[PDB]
Symmetry: D2
C-alpha cells in the first residue's frame, strides 16, 4: 500500500524531467512514512522554466495553435486524468492526507476543469464593434497574456492545480508551476499527463521548491506576465508587492477566507446541519471555502449547533486510504499546530466548545476532530482568523440584516452559504453578502462552468469558467479606420 521507499521526483522544464540535487523529503501526513522526495529548485531553475515557458509561448508552439489543438491536448489530458485517477489520488493522499474517496472525487472535478477549459479554449472570444460608423471598425481581441506563473497550496494540490492550469493553458498561455513543497507529486504527475496529452515542451513547467525561494522568485520574475497565486492572504500580499517591484505582472489571487454559512430557521435544518458539518469538515477544514462561521437564526441556533455536533461526531475520521474515511490528516505540522492553537485560543477567550476541540489520536499522523465553538464574540481570534482547520465558530442572529452584517463582518469574502427555504432571505443574503462563491441550500457544489474567486482580501480575479480562461488573456481593443483620414495638420 504505502511506498517502501519515498518516490524521488524530478522537476519539469521544457518537456525535460530534471533530476534534483537538493530535495524536500515529504512524509505522509497521515502515516508518518516517507512518501516522496521533491527537488528543491533554485531561482536559476525557475529562470530556465520561465525561459522555456517564454520560448514555448513566443514560438507559437501553443498560443499559435488553433484553439482546437489546445482543446485536443486538454481533452486528452482530461482523458488521461480519468485513466490515472487512482494513481493521482494515491499520490495526492500520500502527500496531502485527504481521504482517498475525496481525492478520487476531486479528480472528477479536475477532469471537468480540463474539459471546461478545452471547451473554453474554443469559445474564448473578444468583441467586434461593427456599429462604430462607415469607416471605423472596432474589435476587442483576447490573446493569452503569455508566461503565467502558477503557485498552488497544499490543501487541494491537484484540484486547485486543475482549477487553474487548464484554464490558463486554454488561451495559449504557458505555465511555470510551483506547487506546495509538501504536495508537489501530483503536480509533477500533471506535468507528465500533459506531456502524454501532447502538450508541447515548455508550456507546462514545474519548478518545485519553497515559497521563499521559487515562489518569491516567480512573483518577482521579470518575465512572468501573470501569476496565479492560491494561498494565504499574507503571501498573496507578498505576491502583490513582488508584482509592483518587478514587472507589474498581473495576479490572479485566490487567498484566505472566513466564510459565513448563514442558516435560517426555515431552512431544512437536517440538510443545513449536514452541509455545515461538511462545509467546515471537508478536507479537515483545510479549505479556503470552508464554512468556518456559522451564522444561524437565534430561534434554532442552539438546536442547530447541536445538529451540527451530531453531524460532526459521525464524520468518519481515519486512514485516508480507508474508502470510508471522510476527513483525513492535517497536511502540515505548522497548520496542525495553528489549528490546535486556535482551538486553545477559542477556549481561552471564553468560547464554548460544543464538540471536538482536540486531536484524533491514531498513534500515527495528525488528525483533528471537527470542532464547533459557540458563544463566539466577533472580537475573538477564532471569529476573525482563518483557522484552516475543521473549526466552526457559531454566531446567532435575529434578522436578515444582522445575518448579512455578521456574514460580512470579515476582511475576507471568498465564499458564503445561505440555508433558507425563503427565496427573499436566500436572495437577500446572496445579493448582500460580499462573497465570490455563494451556495444557496448547498455547499461546495458547482463545477468549473462558473468563475470562482473572492471579494475583499480573499483575492483578485476569477478562476474557472470562461472567466478563468479570460483572466489569463489580455484585452486588445483595435480600431481600424477604413475611410481616408481627415488630416489633423493642413
Amino acid at each position: 500500500s504505502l511506498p517502501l521507499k519515498p518516490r524521488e521526483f524530478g522537476f519539469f522544464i521544457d518537456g525535460e524531467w530534471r533530476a534534483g540535487k537538493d530535495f524536500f523529503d515529504r512524509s505522509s501526513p497521515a502515516h508518518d512514512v516517507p512518501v516522496t522526495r521533491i527537488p528543491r529548485c533554485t531561482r536559476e531553475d525557475l529562470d530556465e522554466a520561465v525561459a522555456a515557458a517564454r520560448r514555448a509561448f513566443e514560438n507559437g508552439s501553443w498560443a499559435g495553435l488553433a484553439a482546437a489543438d489546445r482543446a485536443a491536448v486538454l481533452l486528452k489530458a482530461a482523458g488521461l486524468l480519468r485513466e490515472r485517477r487512482d494513481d493521482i489520488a494515491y499520490w495526492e493522499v500520500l502527500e496531502n492526507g485527504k481521504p482517498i474517496s475525496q481525492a478520487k472525487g476531486e479528480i472528477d472535478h479536475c477532469i471537468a476543469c480540463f474539459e471546461m477549459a478545452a471547451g473554453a479554449a474554443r469559445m474564448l472570444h473578444g468583441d467586434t464593434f461593427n456599429n462604430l460608423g462607415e469607416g471605423l471598425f472596432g474589435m476587442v481581441l483576447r490573446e493569452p497574456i503569455g508566461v503565467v506563473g502558477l503557485i498552488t497550496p497544499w490543501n487541494f494540490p491537484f484540484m486547485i492545480l486543475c482549477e487553474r492550469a487548464p484554464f490558463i493553458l486554454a488561451s495559449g498561455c504557458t505555465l511555470v508551476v510551483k506547487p506546495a513543497e509538501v504536495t508537489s507529486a501530483t503536480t509533477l504527475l500533471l506535468a507528465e499527463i500533459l506531456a502524454d496529452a501532447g502538450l508541447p515542451k515548455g508550456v507546462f513547467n514545474v519548478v518545485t521548491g519553497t515559497g521563499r525561494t521559487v515562489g518569491q522568485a516567480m512573483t518577482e520574475h521579470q518575465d512572468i506576465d501573470m501569476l496565479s497565486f492560491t494561498g494565504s492572504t499574507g503571501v498573496g500580499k507578498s505576491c502583490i508587492h513582488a508584482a509592483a517591484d518587478s514587472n507589474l505582472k498581473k495576479l490572479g489571487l485566490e487567498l484566505g477566507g472566513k466564510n459565513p454559512i448563514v442558516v435560517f430557521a426555515d431552512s431544512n435544518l437536517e440538510d443545513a446541519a449536514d452541509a455545515v458539518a461538511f462545509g467546515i469538515s471537508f478536507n479537515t477544514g483545510q479549505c479556503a471555502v470552508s464554512s468556518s462561521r456559522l451564522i444561524v437564526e437565534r430561534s434554532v441556533a442552539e438546536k442547530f449547533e447541536r445538529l451540527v455536533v451530531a453531524k460532526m461526531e459521525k464524520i468518519r475520521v481515519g486512514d485516508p486510504f480507508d474508502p470510508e474515511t471522510q476527513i483525513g490528516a492535517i497536511t502540515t505540522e505548522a497548520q496542525n499546530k495553528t489549528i490546535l492553537d486556535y482551538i486553545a485560543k477559542g477556549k481561552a477567550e471564553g468560547a464554548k466548545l460544543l464538540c471536538g476541540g482536540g486531536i484524533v489520536d491514531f498513534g500515527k499522523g495528525q488528525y483533528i476532530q471537527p470542532t464547533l465553538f459557540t458563544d463566539v464574540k466577533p472580537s475573538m481570534g477564532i471569529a476573525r482568523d482563518e483557522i484552516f482547520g475543521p473549526v466552526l465558530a457559531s454566531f446567532h442572529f435575529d434578522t436578515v440584516d444582522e445575518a448579512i452584517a455578521i456574514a460580512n463582518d470579515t476582511v475576507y469574502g471568498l465564499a458564503a452559504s445561505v440555508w433558507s427555504k425563503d427565496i427573499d432571505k436566500a436572495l437577500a443574503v446572496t445579493r448582500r453578502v460580499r462573497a465570490g462563491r455563494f451556495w444557496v441550500n448547498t455547499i461546495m457544489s458547482g463545477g468549473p462552468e462558473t468563475p470562482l474567486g473572492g471579494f475583499k482580501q480573499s483575492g483578485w480575479g476569477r478562476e474557472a469558467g470562461l472567466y478563468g480562461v479570460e483572466e489569463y488573456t489580455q484585452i486588445k481593443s483595435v480600431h481600424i479606420e477604413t475611410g481616408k483620414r481627415s488630416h489633423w495638420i493642413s
Copy 2:
C-alpha cells in the same frame, strides 16, 4: 479670451456637500503664468470622511440599490449637463492644463459619449445564468458594484480621463472618492457639481483634492476603499500596488505609462500616416499616455517618412490654448516641462539625431515645447525607452514585419500601438502580435468608449470604458442553488 480676474477658489466635495478648504494649492495657468484657481489641499481626515460618505452612500442603497435605470438617468442627465457646460468645463480645463480650447471642447464630446456609454452599460451590466447544471442545481453569476472606489487621475486629460472612469465606475452602483491631479483639480470639481445637478445622490461622488503623496497615497492605503482606479505613471502605479498589498488588498484598475509604437509600412498611405504620426506624438503636446512616441517605419521609406513627419510637425499650430486654431498647448507642469527638455537633451547627448523641434516655443509666457522628432535612435537610448510624456518622437527603422513587431514590443509598456499599412496581413500581424491594449490600424487615438481601453505589461491592470470598464468595478459572485433533496454527506 479672458482669464479670471482673481483665481477661482474651489471647495472640495464630500457627501453631496461642498467644503471650504483650509489650506489651498494655488494653480496658475501653465499657458499664461497667471493665477487661475485655488484648490483645497485636503487632509487625510477629509479623505476618511469622503470614504465614509462613499461607504455610507454605497451601503445604504442610495445608489447601488437603485435600478440601473436610475443610475442611467443620472449619467444621461450628467451627459446632458456636460453638453450644456462644455464651454465652461473646457475653459477651466484649458486654464489648469494648458491644452487648446478646441481640443478641450472636443474632449468633452468624448466625455459625453462616456457618460452615455456608462448610462447604457448601467442597464446592460449583467452576469450569467447556468441553467444547464442539472435539474437540482441552478447556477448563476452575479455582478455587483465592488463598493467604494478610489479614483486618482492625472493632469494630462483631467476631465476626460475622469469621465473615462467615473461614469463607468458609477454605472454599476459603485461610489467614488476622487483625487484629481493637484494642478488640474478644477474640472473634476466641476464634474462633482454636474453630477449633483444630474441628481447623483450625496456621497456617491466625492472629490478630495490634494497631492498624490498625501491624499492619493492615503487613498491607495485606505482600509475602506474596495477598488482604486489609478491613471498615471507606472512608478506611482507601483506605489498603488504596494499600498493595496499593505492595506486591504483593494483591487486596482491601473492605467499607467506607455512608450507606444506607431508602425508605418511602406505600403501605408504615408501622408495619412505622417499626419497621424505627427498628431500621435503632438496631441496634448505629447502629454498623452497613448501617444505614438516610437515611430517604427519601414527602412525603405524611413527617411521620406521622417521628413514627412517633420513637415507635419513644423505646421502644428503651437500657441495660446484659447486660440481655437491652436493645435497643441502648454506643458501642464514645470516638472514635466523640465523632464521633456531633459529627455531632449539626453536624446542629443546619447547621439540621436534631432530632425525638428528639440526646444521650447517661447511666447514669453507659459511653457511650450516644439514637436520633436529624433532619428538614429538606438533601442538602449533613454528616449527609446523612457516615456518622455512630451511631443518627442523617436524614429526606428525596420525591414521586416517581424522586426517592426520586435521593435514595437521592445518596451516594458504595452498601452497602445498604431500600425499603418494597407496590407491586411501586415496590419493583422502587427495588431495581433504587438503587446498593446489599444490598437489603431490606419488611425490613431480613435474609437469611442464602446470599447475597453487599457494596457499590457507595465502599462496597467484592467480595462476601462466599454461594458468591460463597468464590469471592472464590479465583483463577480457565483451562486449555486441546490433544489430538491440534499444527499447527506454524513450517514
Copy 3:
C-alpha cells in the same frame, strides 16, 4: 380633460414627410364614443413607397452607416422628447385605446426606458472576435442591421409596444416601416414626429397606417422588407409566417398570443398574490398578451384565495380613462369586446362565475367587469383560449408538478407568474413552465433590460434588451487567412 371637438386628421409618414391621406379610417374613442382621430387608410403603393424610403435610408448609410453614437444620440433625444410629450402622447394613446391616462403615462416611462436601453444597446451591439483560431486564421462574428424592418403592432399597447420594438430595431441601424393597429395609429404617428424632431434621418422610420388586410399583409409579403416585427394574434403571426415563406424569407420576430399562468402557492404572500392576480388579469382591462389569464392556485388556499381575488377584483376602479384614479379603461374594439363577452358567455360550459361576467355601463364606451371563473375544467374555452379581456380562469392544484403541468397545458408560452416564498417551488415552476417572460412574486415588473418573448405559439425571437437589438441584426462570420 377635453375630448377633441373634431377628430384630429393625421397624415402618414414616409421619408420624413407627412403625407395627406386620401381615404381615412375614422376612429372614435372606445371609452367615449366620440370621433377622436382620422387616420390615412394607406395603399400597397404607400407601403411600397415607405419600404423604398426605408430601403434608401438604409442603403445610403444615413442611419446604419452612422456611428452607434449618432443613433444613440437620436434615440436619447427621442427619449427626451417622449418625456416632454408624455402628456400629449398619453392623451392620444387614451383617446384611441381607452386605457387609463395614469397607465398610459406610466407606459410612457417604460417607452423612455426602452429608448434609453436601445440607445445604450446601440453602442454595445457587438459580435465576437475569435483570436484563438491559430496565428494564420483570424475569426470574427459581425453584427449588422438586417436592413428594412417592417413593424406591425397591435392596439392594446400601441405606443408602448411600438417603443418596445422600434428603438431596438433602430439602434442597430435598421430602418423601419411601421403599420400600427388601424384603430390605434395616432401615437405611432406621434412617434414618427418625435423621431423626426429627435433628428432621425428621413426614411428611417416610416408609418404606413391602415388595415392588416391591406398594409400589414403587404408588409409581410414585401419583397424588400428584410425582417418583420409582428406583435399581435398567433393567427396573424402564422399569416406573417406564410407571407415570409411566399415572399423573400424575411425574418420574423413574432410576439403572439398567450394564455399565461399565474401559479399561486399557499406559502406565497397571498395578499400580494391576490393583488397581483387581480392586476395581472385586469391591467389594460385584460387586453394584454402577458396577462395572467389562468390562476393556478394551491387547493389548500384556493377558494380562500379566489375570495381575495374576488375582493380585490371588485375594488378595481373602472371608469373614464381620463380619470387619474381609473385603473381599467375601455375595451379598445367592438370585436374584442364581443369576443370577451362571448367568452364570458361560453364560460357560463359550466364554469362558476365568481365576479364580473358583464359589461360596466357608464352609458358610453365599452367597459367589461374584471371577471373571475372557478370550477374551470382544462377543456373549457375560457380555460384554454386567449380571451384578451379581464377574465380570469381559476384552476386548483395540490403539487408543484400539477401546477407546472397545468401551467404548461397551453399551446402558448408567453408569460408566467409564480407566487411562493419557497425558493424551491419558485425555481421549479420558473424553470419548468415553458414561458418566455416569468415573474416570481411579482407581475409585469421587468424593464427593457431583459429580452421579452414567448415559447411555443406565443412567438419567435425576443424583443427588448440587447437581445432585441441583436434580433434585428444579421450575424456575419468572417474568417481571414
Copy 4:
C-alpha cells in the same frame, strides 16, 4: 471494398434499431452498385420517434442532466467518431460520392463540432440582471427548446448532421433526424455512435425516408418544438409554411446560396485562383457555400480566369475511394441533370465556356467537370440560379462598389469570399456584402467556433458556435421581487 449486397439499415427510435418495411435502395452515385437499403419510414414511425424524443426530453434523461453529462456523451461521441472515421467515411463516400480524403477530413470537422458542442454544453448560459434594484432581481435563462427536428441534405450528410445534432443535443434538446433519403447511412451510424457514447434512448432518433413523407411530417408535427432544416430554399419555405400551419415551431433554416468570391487585382491571384477553383469544385460544387460567382477585377479578370481554368483542369476527378481524387460524383441523378442543364443553359444564353462544360466519363458514375463561364450577364440563369455543381460564373468589376453590388446581386446571402491584400477592400466587401459566412483571403476555412448561416433567402438562424447551441434554446426572462 464495395458492398457485395446493399447494407440494409434499420431506423433508430428510442435507442432501438427498427427494421424497415418499405425500403429506399441507394446505389453508389460514383459506382452504380447497390450500396444501402434504407427504411422508408412512415409518418407513424416519425410520430413514434417524436414521442420518444418528447419522452426523453420530458423525463429529464437528457435535458435534466448536468451539462457535464451531456458534454461527456458528446466528447465520447467525438472519440467514437475518431475511432470510426474510416467506417463513417466509407459509407459516406458510398452514398454521397464525395472523395474518401474529403469524407475523412469532413469527419475531423465533425469531431471538432462534437467537441465544440460538448464545450458549449457547459458554457450555455443566460444573464443575471443584478442591476435592477435592491427589490428586483432579473434573470435570463436559456433552456433546451425541447424536441428538435433535424432534416439534412445529401451533399454533406455526416458533416451537416454533426454541424447540427451535437449543438442541438448540447442544450438538452432531443432529436428526430431525417437525413437525405439518398444519404442516410452515416446518420444511422451517428445514431449508433451516440448510443455507444451513452446518449440516452430517445434523445437521437433517425427516421429515414423522404422529405415529402417524413420531412413534411416533421415540419408539420404538433410536437416538434423547433426544426433544423438544411436544404433547398424551396423546401425551406415549405418548412416555414408547415411551421405556420402546425405548432409555430422555430426553424433553423440553412438554405440555398449563390455565393460570390470577389477577387481583386491586389489579391494573391494564384492563391485566389486556387481558392476559386476549390470554392466551386469542392464537393463537386454540391455545396451551399460554394463560390459560384467569381467577381473579379476587370484589370486582371481574363488573366485570373485563365489561372482558374488551369486550376480546374488539374483538379483530380475520379473514383472517390482513390485518396488522390479531389472531387467526386454528383450525388443524385436529378442534381446531375440540373447541373448539366444549367451548363446547357449557360451556353444557350450566350455565356462563354472557358473550361469543363461536360461530364467526366468514367463508364460508371455521374461526374461533372469543373466548369467556368465568363461573359456572364446578371440576367443569365447560371448567374442567378443555384446550380449546386462545379459551375463557376465569372463577372468583372472596376470598382469596389461594383464588386459589392454584383456580390449582393442575389436573393441569397449564405456565403461570400473576398480576395485582396488591401485591408480596406477586404473590410469594405466583408462589411457590405450580405452573406452570413465570409472568407477573407480564404474559402471554407472556419471551424465550429463560429456561427454559420445566411442572410436573406439563404436561411434563418445560425448553427455551430455557442450561438448555434443557443439557437435551440428558449430565452426565459425571470423577474423576482
